[PDB]
Design a protein around this nucleic acid. Structure first.
Ligand code: DGT
Ligand code: MG
Ligand code: MN
Length: 567
DNA sequence: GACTGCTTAC
DNA sequence: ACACGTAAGCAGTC
């Protein structure tokens, strides 16, 4: 059995002088076996000898320093596991999962140390993990702005902080390990846990591995959340209003909607109703016009004729070439007049409900009876199961290298593909979610300001009748009354501000409130820049050079300030 | 445009 | 083989 260590670095912040000044490691199963020191050389000597599993919190950061050292001390990158090489799992999106450092083989047994990201299991800051896992946490922080020359000696206080940090993570990881949550990521524990419940034999039967060609066809119909701002309210100062948000929307669809399973049947032309294959994806070419009084529902991506984020009123004289689930197509027919519809071909599926019951019951109970990180973890188990079913087969990743200037660079690796999980489930989970949210928005047409995926933002403070019997703060698939606001302003998708009514005892109301809480929502905008925002300055053209940007420099990674501009 | 390489809102 | 998802976005290179 391989030993497991919780590890951390403390690093300098200068582009011209980027290095580790402190490191710590601690045996997760024996806290007495730990060590803190001021030399990366000393840490990496231990790394190469220990032949164990290491965890850093935010491997993307520490990993840069580790790979900088490896490239300087005779290691090259290799997928083959050759002596004096290292392998990585770094995704196309720049997510770090693994560094596997190989010293060679004794016979057929690999001599290696593997380094994982604890952030993939526990995606919270260390102090938040301590608070919600109820672990010991020291008050205060290391001063990162302090000058620290090579050989700088670690103070007793700094020592205690490093030791605390690695112990918090060690303790939290062990809590999860002893629960059987032992995979390298939350998502991986999620899919495995679901397979444990239904059995692997049943998984294979009910969710067969589709061919890459068929999977690709299915994925044409795979889309995400309905995120939409009503033109009527775009960039206007709004008065009183409210937000409702579905409790676990996608898991609620998984729980109760008609969903596909098994091998699809290919058909040509228009789908013909088949009660045993009641779900389908249809390939069409058509033109369309939005019906008066209906919310637009069609957005077209990867087309030279359309803005991909724009919900379309009209096909505008071009032919829309679409692969659509039956859920989407019926919603399209409800909201649009369709013209010159060419039904080309498609795929039909067997379907049933309840395939995720026990799994959803388990994690919902945990979600409903927990708070903070624990609640958020339960939420992630539910949502990552959906994600795992729609896992892209393309697992091509990034290959690190040391460039001439001594900083790490990356190149796109060789094409790698893995088996599809079950992409039709992904297609229909999101289609039903879109249906749920859009049906509610449409029933609130007179008051609807904005939707993002599973929310409705409404003018006025009275609960609409369409959801009045299904408002609840926790219950699966019910609408939580998220907030009531005194005023708001919506510039564009995922970009809005609200003055929310609050009460001290939490969410408040126009009659009973003690405080007004200014809330900024803006995709891309980081926390310090949000603190700059006011009702007055929140507008297209707003810009602040205060967005931290991680930059590869010689020795590792530093944060430098970049701009964020509302363009 | 494609691409790299980051963010937050779901 | 390991490795949850789309969406909307900003700031760059070539
Ligand atoms: N695959 C995946 N989907 C997510 C994730 N976060 C949100 N989503 C999708 C699925 C969610 O049901 C949906 C709406 O997000 P919310 O933030 O409202 O979470 P949800 O509604 O699940 O729970 P809550 O509203 O917190 O009770 O967006 C994620 O981390 N992974
Ligand atoms: Mg939501
Ligand atoms: Mn929700």
């Amino acid at each position: 059995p391989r030993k497991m260590y919780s590890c951390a670095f403390e690093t300098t912040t200068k582009v011209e002088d980027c290095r580790v000044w402190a490191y710590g490691y601690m045996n997760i199963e024996d806290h007495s076996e730990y060590k803190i020191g001021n030399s990366l050389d000393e840490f990496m000597a231990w790394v190469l000898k220990v032949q164990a599993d290491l965890y850093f919190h935010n491997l993307k950061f520490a990993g840069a320093f580790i790979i900088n050292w490896l490239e300087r001390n005779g290691f090259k990158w290799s997928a083959d596991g050759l002596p004096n090489t290292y392998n990585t799992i770094i995704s196309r999106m720049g997510q770090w999962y693994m560094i596997d450092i190989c010293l060679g083989y004794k016979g057929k047994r690999k001599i290696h140390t593997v380094i994982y990201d604890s952030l993939k299991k526990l995606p919270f800051p260390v102090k938040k993990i301590a608070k919600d896992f109820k672990l010991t946490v020291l008050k205060g922080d290391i001063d990162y702005h302090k000058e620290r020359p090579v050989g700088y000696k670690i103070t007793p206080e700094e020592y205690a902080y490093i030791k605390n940090d690695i112990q918090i993570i060690a303790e939290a990881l062990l809590i999860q390990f002893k629960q059987g949550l032992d995979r390298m990521t939350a998502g991986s524990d999620s899919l495995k846990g679901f397979k444990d419940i239904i059995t692997t034999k049943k998984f294979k039967k009910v969710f067969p591995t589709l061919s890459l060609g068929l999977d690709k066809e299915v994925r044409y119909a795979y889309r995400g959340g309905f995120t939409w701002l009503n033109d009527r309210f775009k960039e206007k100062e709004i008065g009183e209003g409210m937000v409702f948000d579905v409790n676990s929307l996608y898991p609620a669809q998984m729980y109760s909607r008609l969903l596909p399973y098994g091998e699809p049947i290919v058909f040509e032309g228009k789908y013909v109703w088949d009660e045993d294959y009641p779900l389908h994806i249809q390939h069409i070419r058509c033109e369309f016009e939005l019906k008066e009084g209906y919310i637009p529902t069609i957005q077209i991506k990867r087309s030279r004729f359309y803005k991909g984020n724009e919900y379309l009123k009209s096909s505008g004289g071009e032919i829309a070439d679409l692969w659509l689930s039956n859920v989407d197509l019926e919603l399209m027919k409800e909201h649009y007049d369709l013209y010159n519809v060419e039904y080309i071909s498609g795929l039909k599926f067997k379907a049933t409900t309840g395939l995720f019951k026990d799994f959803i019951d388990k994690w919902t109970y945990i979600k409903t009876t927990s708070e903070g990180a624990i609640k958020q973890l339960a939420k992630l188990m539910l949502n990552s199961l959906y994600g795992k079913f729609a896992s892209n087969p393309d697992v091509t990743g990034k290959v690190p290298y040391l460039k001439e200037n001594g900083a790490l660079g990356f190149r796109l690796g060789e094409e790698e593909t893995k088996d599809p999980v079950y992409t039709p489930m992904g297609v229909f989970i999101t289609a039903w979610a879109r249906y749920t949210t859009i049906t509610a928005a449409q029933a609130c047409y007179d008051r609807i300001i904005y939707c993002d995926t599973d929310s409705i933002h409404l003018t006025g403070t009275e609960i609409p009748d369409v959801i009045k019997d299904i408002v609840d703060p926790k219950k699966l698939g019910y609408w939580a009354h998220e907030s009531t606001f005194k005023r708001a302003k919506y510039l564009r998708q995922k970009t809005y501000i609200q003055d929310i009514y609050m009460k001290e005892v939490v969410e408040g109301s126009p009659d009973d409130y003690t405080d007004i809480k200014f809330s900024v929502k803006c995709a891309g905008m980081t926390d310090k820049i949000k603190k700059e925002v006011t009702f007055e300055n929140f507008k297209v053209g707003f810009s602040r050079k205060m967005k931290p940007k991680p930059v590869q420099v010689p020795g590792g990674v530093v944060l430098v300030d970049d701009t964020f501009t509302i363009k």
